[PDB]
Amino acid sequence: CRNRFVKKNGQCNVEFTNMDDKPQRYIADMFTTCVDIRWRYMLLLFSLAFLVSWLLFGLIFWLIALIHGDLENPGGDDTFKPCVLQVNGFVAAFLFSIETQTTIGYGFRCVTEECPLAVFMVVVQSIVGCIIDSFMIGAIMAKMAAPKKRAQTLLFSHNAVVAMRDGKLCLMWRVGNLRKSHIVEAHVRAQLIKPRITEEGEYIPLDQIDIDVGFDKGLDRIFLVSPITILHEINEDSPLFGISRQDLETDDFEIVVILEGMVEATAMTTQARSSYLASEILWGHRFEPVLFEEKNQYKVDYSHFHKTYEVPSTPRCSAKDLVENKFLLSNS
Amino acid sequence: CRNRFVKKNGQCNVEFTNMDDKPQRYIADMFTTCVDIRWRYMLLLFSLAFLVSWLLFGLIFWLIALIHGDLENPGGDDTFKPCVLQVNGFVAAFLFSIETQTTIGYGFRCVTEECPLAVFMVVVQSIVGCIIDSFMIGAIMAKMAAPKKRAQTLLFSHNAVVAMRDGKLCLMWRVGNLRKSHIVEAHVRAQLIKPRITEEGEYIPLDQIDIDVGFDKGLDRIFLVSPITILHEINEDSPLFGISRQDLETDDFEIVVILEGMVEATAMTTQARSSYLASEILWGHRFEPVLFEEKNQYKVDYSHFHKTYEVPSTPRCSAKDLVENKFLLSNS
Amino acid sequence: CRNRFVKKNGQCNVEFTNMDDKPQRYIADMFTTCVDIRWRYMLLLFSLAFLVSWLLFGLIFWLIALIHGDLENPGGDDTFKPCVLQVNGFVAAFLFSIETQTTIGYGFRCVTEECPLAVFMVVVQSIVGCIIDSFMIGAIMAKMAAPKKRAQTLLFSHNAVVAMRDGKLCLMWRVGNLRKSHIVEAHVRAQLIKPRITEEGEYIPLDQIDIDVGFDKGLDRIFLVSPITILHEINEDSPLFGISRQDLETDDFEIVVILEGMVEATAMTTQARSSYLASEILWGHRFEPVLFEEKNQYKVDYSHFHKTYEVPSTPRCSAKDLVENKFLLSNS
Amino acid sequence: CRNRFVKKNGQCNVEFTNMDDKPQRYIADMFTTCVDIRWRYMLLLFSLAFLVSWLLFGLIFWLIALIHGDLENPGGDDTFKPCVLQVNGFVAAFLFSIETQTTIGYGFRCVTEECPLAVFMVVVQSIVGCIIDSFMIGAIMAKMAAPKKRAQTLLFSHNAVVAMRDGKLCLMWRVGNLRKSHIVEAHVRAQLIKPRITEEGEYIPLDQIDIDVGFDKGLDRIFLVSPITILHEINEDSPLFGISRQDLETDDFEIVVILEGMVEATAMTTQARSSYLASEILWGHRFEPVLFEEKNQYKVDYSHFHKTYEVPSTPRCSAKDLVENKFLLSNS
Ligand SMILES: [K+]
Ligand SMILES: [K+]
Ligand SMILES: [K+]
Ligand SMILES: [K+]
Ligand SMILES: [K+]
Ligand SMILES: [K+]
């Protein structure tokens, strides 16, 4: 009922305000800023840069022609040589500027040996043109390769389940790869999200509490080919230790799940996220198997991926009740 | 007898089906998609992009010439100036389009100061041409650098062995580097693959069970120069604890081995994989040494890399038998 | 009073001297060297490279024209063909050199089929031009993407605090993200900086002593959306164990804080640093909450980020006193 | 006396032989292969690629001119239009090929609307030219950024020392950064190298034995500004446990030291290595302090970096002797 901290699609539900220094901080960070904005704005920006330098040098060449007197004698003659042939006005200056910087160089408008300043300006513009190109190439390459997109070929089950596995009460959710290309050095994490008040009365608007997926033993590291069911064994140290099936219909909390790993092709790290609300957690359920063997290989049927079935033999009490009860029986 | 989950060459043996959303998910992920397809398709795609934009602008310039009336007066005269010189029809329009976007700019077909729209279109096409170039460069750079190729200069022994080392029964396989360039931050993992039924009757089509290579102590991290023999000591926590030489000819299971690390030049992570079936594991064997010293250095003879010899003194029972037996003797 | 090892802005306060081999070591490392210098020097260097090769080949073409005799017959005639058309002197040679290497290729100055050496030199310069371009592109891309800039969209609280949380005395500082884009695989570290003398009398000018943020349990790994308060519980192993509120006004030491993680877009690791002097640590204080819920989402108010309030119930003695005192009471 | 496995400069002392499949394995890995070879070979290879495609298309255009009959009428007339203007023979064909692929496009030799095949070939060559460019750019960028070069601005002390620190016998060596730019996520490892025979008689030509630098506690992770002394406390689990000052003049072994971390600018991982022979380890010595404070900052004097002084109070026995002796005294 409270609210969702992280959407099922991985998107975070918080917005920032009253940030103070953001513009100056975004300028020092401008590259990050630049690759974060939408494609259409990034490109708009670069085409502006091209446009602006074309106009600028165009203006320079125009001025040079003006003062040198080339406007009235564009192609020269035996007695007169222009700084740049065929610049008759501003459009021509602009065209020349475009043809030089882009290195198209049609040649109708062309530099001559006449004016050291025009030759100089052609040197500057060629360099400046390489610089801008380099920036545009860099930004495009970067933004293109963005690894977070890989998270959309990665999959979490719509639900998480609670069931007995190997004698232990466990929280389980399913991750899968939608591509035949690997997630290298993949590993999982999970957190329980909810506000709480400490014993000193300090109010924590949202506390983030680890959910042990096997980090200490290195079992958080998975080799992901066909879908894996991720397991949190609920025990003395689990924030879920004292929670039973009925506490699930009542309580308001959220479990954030994460899967990190490197996109095989680029070895770049992507982070895939989802979330399970208390109401999205199915007590006493098990995931339908997606994997099966055929003659020469194994196949994953992905239409069973989200599916679960009831296991009525599942205990309805907390792992705490389960432990303590075990010790009334074992104790008498 | 069951089947192989991972081929000796590292290739995974599973195929995906009934995937639902794949096309839309592959489009949001399109870059990953694009660098995953074969070189010939990726290139085909880019040349299509070039072709398509050339044709398109060619078409534009053609239309402009048409309406302006340049088709009937390609080179102009004292009284008439075309939007783009020498466009006499569609081929010429197309050529002009190619020469502008590629920045070849022969110049026979050439823009004039006459039509703001033609000049404008030359501005747009130059920008658009830089964008496409940038994409092609990005994709090629990425696909070219793909780190998984490095896995083919990395090597696993064809067999794994079981032998006593330093008083402990151990599973061993050999990894090696085929290049004089390093694998940075290299480390190993192994898993035992097989289906199993839990005590609650839940059927796991393939369970992946860690094989402890030294993670807790950090001994999973290796410095790989000449071939290292990787060691799994079989003990109370080893899934192999209760397995003896005869259980090996009988049982059906598989051990997946992994070696991850960064290609020295690019510091990109590669994952190298292989697999040992129960029948590919040699009980009571040891690897032939590949390393030997000469006057000023050490040399690795790689023709001994896969070779093993029998060690008949090796115990034929399980590490479990071995432990418990030790405590009948030590116990009486 | 001593001095600050790391500035609040993350900048390190040490300078190096008497380095010996620096120039030769910087040359072998030249790329790193090159991307470390300021933008204006890096660019100055590349434009020098362009300039130098233009001049050089310009010189070559000039010499070729000279000896071949093209200077006196620039455009040739029925009886004579120049090596490169229209090179009348050095400026023209230079222009030709620029037009070829940049691939502008106006065409007024143009290579002919006449001299194998001129054609050859055009081949060499085209290649050489691609090489230099490639270097400039590489350097610019790299320097542009530098991940340390991301650290300026990351934030530490101006102060650190000491307060009871969940029955334990803790040192706390606050980190936050100023962007809606993630820090992937983020984690924290902290060190206590100060000189000390060992029991053998060895003087360590500055010793760096770990401050346990949860590494053993993996709690150093944070998922950072809205600001997290980082917690050091002061206990038997904490270098702060024996320090009380009064020891804070007296002692001279420093706590260096670090947050590392990958910029989402580029998956490149950035390191963000700050520092708290003893005098910058507020005993008996708690951070003002920045996070609050509204109808459909959560919002962070960043104007409360640095703010703290007094918690007068906080004990003023050391965690050591606190422990030992607990055992006089529990002991009688 | 035996031999050095890793040189002081980090270079590994082993060579590989009898490798079998190397060529085919190097071809699948060709990119890695290509960025590993020397600059002069890599460039030679690309200029070959340029040369080869220029020649090839040059040949095509020549053939086209030949059959079409352009060789005898290079510039055409009112009644005849060539496929490509001004191709009079092979040199001209070659020039045209160069001018098109490089996009120089002088324009004297120029495509016409006449032959669909010539136009087609201009399309193919433009694309092919972009592809090759892209490869060359990729390879150069990669090879340029190689992170291992960073290891030459990183430094190990020429010697390692053995001395008491804080009541414990420790092996110590010194690492330092020669740049004002950081090594991000830096950490250390060390190994003891030597051949040995197991209790089963198995001969290990060189065994690599971990030297505990603090991995379990996370103290292997260092924040490196001014030089750090790395510490191996010699204890029950140290392979050096039973080694005393005299065992050092006698025994033959080697300690390999490693420092890994990401180059700040590129966030690429570099590995820096060195080695200490038994004879390069100084028993009863301490490093001279390089760090000192001045008015507004700290400075590192790098001329003291390798220097050590004698500490005559250092015990000359093994950590084993030291422990056991402690328990004869404490025991009576
Ligand atoms: K031209
Ligand atoms: K890159
Ligand atoms: K541990
Ligand atoms: K060009
Ligand atoms: K051109
Ligand atoms: K041109």
Curated annotation (Swiss-Prot), chains A, B, C, D:
Q: What is its main location?
A: membrane
Entry function: Inward rectifying potassium channel that probably participates in controlling the resting membrane potential in electrically excitable cells. Probably participates in establishing action potential waveform and excitability of neuronal and muscle tissues. Inward rectifier potassium channels are characterized by a greater tendency to allow potassium to flow into the cell rather than out of it. Their voltage dependence is regulated by the concentration of extracellular potassium; as external potassium is raised, the voltage range of the channel opening shifts to more positive voltages.
What's a single GO CC term here? monoatomic ion channel complex
Q: How does it sit in the membrane?
A: Multi-pass membrane protein
Q: Which residues bind a 1,2-diacyl-sn-glycero-3-phospho-(1D-myo-inositol-4,5-bisphosphate)?
A: R38, R40, K143, K148
| Short motif (Selectivity filter): ranges | 103-108
Q: What is this protein called?
A: ATP-sensitive inward rectifier potassium channel 12
GO annotation, biological process: potassium ion import across plasma membrane; potassium ion transport; protein homotetramerization; regulation of monoatomic ion transmembrane transport
| Subcellular compartments | Membrane; Cell membrane; Cell membrane, Sarcolemma, T-tubule
Gene name for this UniProt entry: KCNJ12
Q: Intramembrane stretches, as ranges? A: 90-106
Per the UniProt entry, what species is this protein from, by scientific name? Gallus gallus (Chicken)
Q: Which residues of the complete protein appear here?
A: 41 to 368 of 429
**Can you tell which superkingdom this protein's organism belongs to?**
Eukaryota
Positions annotated to bind K(+) 3: I104, G105
Please list the residue ranges that the record places on the Cytoplasmic side of the membrane: 144-328
Instruction: Family membership, please give it.
Output: Belongs to the inward rectifier-type potassium channel family.
